[PDB]
Scaffold this active site. Structure first.
Site, PDB file in Angstrom:
ATOM      1  N   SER A 102      24.031 -25.771  20.032  1.00 27.35           N
ATOM      2  CA  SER A 102      23.004 -26.642  20.569  1.00 27.35           C
ATOM      3  C   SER A 102      22.783 -27.804  19.615  1.00 27.35           C
ATOM      4  O   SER A 102      22.946 -27.679  18.402  1.00 27.35           O
ATOM      5  CB  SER A 102      21.713 -25.838  20.771  1.00 27.35           C
ATOM      6  OG  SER A 102      20.619 -26.660  21.094  1.00 27.35           O
ATOM      7  N   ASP A 108      26.204  -8.728  31.548  1.00 29.43           N
ATOM      8  CA  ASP A 108      25.928  -8.962  30.132  1.00 29.43           C
ATOM      9  C   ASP A 108      27.003  -9.860  29.533  1.00 29.43           C
ATOM     10  O   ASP A 108      28.085  -9.372  29.168  1.00 29.43           O
ATOM     11  CB  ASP A 108      25.873  -7.640  29.384  1.00 29.43           C
ATOM     12  CG  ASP A 108      25.585  -7.811  27.914  1.00 29.43           C
ATOM     13  OD1 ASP A 108      25.204  -8.928  27.503  1.00 29.43           O
ATOM     14  OD2 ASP A 108      25.724  -6.809  27.169  1.00 29.43           O
TER      15      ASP A 108
END
Length: 330
Positions: free
Chosen positions: A199, A35
């Site tokens: 992004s 994770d």
């Protein structure tokens, strides 16, 4: 040193991925959910409330000659999906894919919430976010990667998740045969303890690329791709009959649909998520309404590049003094 371990989807939908981890002496192998969005290595154990164990493999520290109770240490964690677990702490030897850390904090669950009990395939979590998020008190503990870093050939790990197929977590090296083209690296902020990056934009299907900054986290422990409501609406508007369902808890779409791809930007590079990766199947057994793999982050407070996005790429978690993330197509 290096390590290399195969990671395997837990079900036919890729709801999560499990990776075998050796704990203790002799080894006890547990299948953990790696994770990159949390920083605790915790396991089902001989201390876990019996009624909360349902098929998981447990760690029994009393059977490990290298286990030592970390006196006074406790842990308690709550995840973004509302699940939680808590307990006490041992140190022990932990190996992943041939890479061994001695003295790793192994957080032994005394209590787990229902979603953990109900998932018999996941024996615990191995956190790979920054150690500043680790919940052990009163002495915060380091992640497996943080403990291994100095010994690794290079201070990196990579995630290569498969679509409906196994993939690989590598530690300490970049397998140049595992991706196509070049790896594009992008800046990371560790200010929230996550692999947080920006992004450069998105496209839906064959549509034009929209240049826009989207701050979010690379989180292998989250199944889906959670993005701003504007972006998600633009995606689902291209799917006939798709709608946001308050009763289901997100966008659903006709199971008869062919989904468009979704592209996200990494600097000047582009990662394409095939449409099929965005299909999470019937909302309930036998339904013709299917659950979407791209969902709004509006209620989260952060955008999350979960497995739907990461499985379309070869992803480098570069833990150099200034961390960065790398993405390549594959």
């Amino acid at each position: 040193s290096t390590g290399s371990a195969t990671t395997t989807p837990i079900d036919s939908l890729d709801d999560a991925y499990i990776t075998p981890v050796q704990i203790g002496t002799p080894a006890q192998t547990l299948n953990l959910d790696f994770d990159t969005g949390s920083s605790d290595l915790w396991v089902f154990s001989s201390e876990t409330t019996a009624s909360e164990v349902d098929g998981q493999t447990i760690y029994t520290p009393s059977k490990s000659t290298t286990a030592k109770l970390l006196s006074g240490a406790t842990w308690s964690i709550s995840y973004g999906d509302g699940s939680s677990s808590s307990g006490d702490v041992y140190t022990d030897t932990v190996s992943v894919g041939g890479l061994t850390v001695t003295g790793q904090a192994v957080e032994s669950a005394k209590k787990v919430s229902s979603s953990f009990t109900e998932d018999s395939t996941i024996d615990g979590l191995l956190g790979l976010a920054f150690s500043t998020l680790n919940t052990v008190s009163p002495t915060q503990q380091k992640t497996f990667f943080d403990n291994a870093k100095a010994s690794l050939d290079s201070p990196v790990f990579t995630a290569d998740l498969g679509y409906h197929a196994p993939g690989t977590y590598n530690f300490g090296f970049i397998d140049t045969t595992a991706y196509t083209g070049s790896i594009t690296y992008t800046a990371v902020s560790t200010k929230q303890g996550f692999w947080e990056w920006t992004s450069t934009g998105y496209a839906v299907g064959s549509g034009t690329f929209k240049s826009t900054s989207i701050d979010g986290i690379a989180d292998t422990g989250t199944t889906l791709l959670y993005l701003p409501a504007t972006v998600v609406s633009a995606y689902w508007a291209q799917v006939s009959g798709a709608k946001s369902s308050s009763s289901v808890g997100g966008y659903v779409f006709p199971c008869s649909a062919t989904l468009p791809s979704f592209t996200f930007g990494v600097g000047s590079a582009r990662i394409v998520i095939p449409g099929d990766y965005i299909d999470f199947g019937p909302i309930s057994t036998g339904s013709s309404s299917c659950f979407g793999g791209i969902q709004s982050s509006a209620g989260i407070g952060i955008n999350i590049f979960g497995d739907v996005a990461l499985k379309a790429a070869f992803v480098v978690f570069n833990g150099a003094t200034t961390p960065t993330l790398g993405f390549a197509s594959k």
